[PDB]
Design a protein around this ligand. Structure first.
Ligand code: HEM
Lengths: 135, 90
């Protein structure tokens, strides 16, 4: 992530992530549909009885990206750390973690046709793919 | 011969599409060939649905600009898919 890449993320998320917190259940669904594979196991959110958890969850994703994006300079391992938490403690496979980010970016492209620009998507995709561990 | 406006528009999306494609770090995919296709097609659907509001002119030329774009987006995506395809065996 170059000094310029970081400036683009803040801009990108600034103008497009304001309502990201409202797209939990939808990004999850896009994943289940576009990527059926992730649907065979999924013992998360107790979907059988709800939408409350994936909904609340969708809020955490937005809040986390907001905090993570606001701190790309000082806390470069925010996403990395978050991803490890899921992979190692929450039983969430790094690919589902990566796919939900994709389906979240897709949702936003749906709900914001003139804000979600190609450059806005590349600037966010680059940040989201920076989930390795930085040093 | 489609329009000096949409002519460049289509060129922009292909440049933007390349920086997107070119910044991809394969060691960080863990996605199957099958899903990588899905991802890329979503990225292309994305660009099309985007420039669908950017194309200018009359319906005839409208659908014409988009159709050329998608034709080109594929031309860039194909080498991408192939290289990534050759990331399995290796
Ligand atoms: C787009 C990427 C994602 C981001 C940014 C994200 C972010 C978060 C955050 C910030 C939390 C709260 C962590 C804490 O307790 O401190 C959380 C919890 C959780 N996440 Fe994710 N997550 C993502 C994808 C996923 C996926 C794909 C799944 C799989 C279904 C998942 C399942 C869970 C579960 C089960 C919890 C515990 C939820 C709870 O009870 O609050 N996450 N996530």
């Amino acid at each position: 992530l170059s000094p310029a890449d970081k400036t683009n993320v803040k801009a990108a998320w600034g103008k497009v992530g304001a309502h990201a917190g409202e797209y939990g259940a939808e990004a999850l669904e896009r994943m289940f549909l576009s990527f059926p594979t992730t649907k065979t196991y999924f013992p998360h959110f107790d979907l059988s009885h709800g939408s409350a958890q994936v909904k609340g969850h969708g809020k955490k994703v937005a809040d986390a990206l907001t905090n993570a994006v606001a701190h790309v300079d000082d806390m470069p391992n925010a996403l990395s750390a978050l991803s490890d938490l899921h992979a190692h403690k929450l039983r969430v496979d790094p690919v589902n973690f990566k796919l939900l980010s994709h389906c979240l970016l897709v949702t936003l492209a749906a709900h914001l046709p003139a804000e979600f620009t190609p450059a806005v998507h590349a600037s966010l995709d680059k940040f989201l793919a920076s989930v390795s561990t930085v040093l | 011969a489609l329009l000096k406006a949409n002519k460049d528009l289509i060129s922009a999306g292909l440049k933007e599409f390349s920086v997107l494609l070119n910044q991809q770090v394969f060691n960080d995919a863990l996605v199957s060939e099958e899903d990588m296709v899905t991802v890329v097609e979503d990225w292309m659907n994305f660009y099309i649905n985007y420039y669908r509001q950017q194309v200018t002119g009359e319906p005839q030329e409208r659908d014409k600009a988009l159709q050329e774009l998608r034709q080109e987006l594929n031309t860039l995506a194909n080498p991408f898919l192939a290289k990534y395809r050759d990331f399995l065996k290796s």
